[PDB]
Amino acid sequence: TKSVLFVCLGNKCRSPIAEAVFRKLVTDQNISENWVIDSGAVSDWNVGRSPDPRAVSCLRNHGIHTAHKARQITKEDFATFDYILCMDESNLRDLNRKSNQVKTCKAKIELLGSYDPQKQLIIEDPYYGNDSDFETVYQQCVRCCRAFLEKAH
Numbered sequence: 261t262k263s264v265l266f267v268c269l270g271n272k273c274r275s276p277i278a279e280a281v282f283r284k285l286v287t288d289q290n291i292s293e294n295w296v297i298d299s300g301a302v303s304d305w306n307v308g309r310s311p312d313p314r315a316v317s318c319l320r321n322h323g324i325h326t327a328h329k330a331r332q333i334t335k336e337d338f339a340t341f342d343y344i345l346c347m348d349e350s351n352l353r354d355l356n357r358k359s360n361q362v363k364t365c366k367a368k369i370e371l372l373g374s375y376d377p378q379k380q381l382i383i384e385d386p387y388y389g390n391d392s393d394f395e396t397v398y399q400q401c402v403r404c405c406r407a408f409l410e411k412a413h
Contacts, residue, residue, distance in 0.1 A: 263296035264408075265337055266372065267346040267355060271301030271330035273387050274347045274397055276311040278372060280319055280326040281401040285409055298341075300333040302354045307332055312387065318394040333358070338365045343412065345372040345404075347383040368413070375407040376400060 266278040279299035286292045301307070309330045310316075319326060337344070338359055344367045346352055352371055359365045373381040383400050386393035 261294050261296055262343075263341045264298075264343040264345060265333070265341045265367070266297075266299040267302065267333060267344055267351055268299075268348075269302050269351060269354075269385070270306040270387075271299055271328075271332075272306050272309055273312045273315050273385065273394070274383055274401075275299035275301070276326050276328045276330075277315050277319060277394070277398055278345070278347075278383075278401045278405065279328060280324050281398065282405045282409075284324050285405050289409070296341075299328060300331050300337065302333065302351060302358075304332040306330045312394075314386075314391055314394045318391065318398050321395075322398065335362045338362045338367050341367040343367060343408075344369045345375075345408070346370070347372060348385065349382065370413060372404045372408075373400065374413065375404040377403060377407055 266275040268275040276299050283297050286295045307330050355369050373383050383397055386397050
């Protein structure tokens with residue numbers, strides 16, 4: 261098996277959409293059983309919370325559902341995941357710093373948008389935006405997730 265953890269600051273908007281998009285992808289390709297997929301937060305502030313309703317509604321528009329509840333990344337995640345794919349530069353900075361406080365970091369830590377063929381590198385926080393911003397995130401996630409499944413960096 262291979263494993264990937266999608267991360268943003270709060271684990272309520274972007275990373276639960278990424279997680280759900282990627283889970284749909286590996287189920288559609290009949291290889292769900294060879295993947296451990298999760299999402300998590302830099303911050304502990306939103307722990308326990310369901311995804312933003314606008315993320316739920318966006319996923320529903322695309323026939324996808326998630327049961328995810330927000331959790332904070334742990335030191336153990338750095339030792340167990342093959343890939344930690346995050347949304348923006350703030351996330352990358354925080355994860356790289358946290359990476360440096362663990363003895364063994366197995367995980368490669370990359371921006372999810374570094375996989376985008378259309379080269380939009382940052383998946384911007386939609387929380388203060390509107391439902392069109394959630395849809396842009398979903399579409400970016402589709403492109404990046406399918407590029408990552410094809411070939412990892």
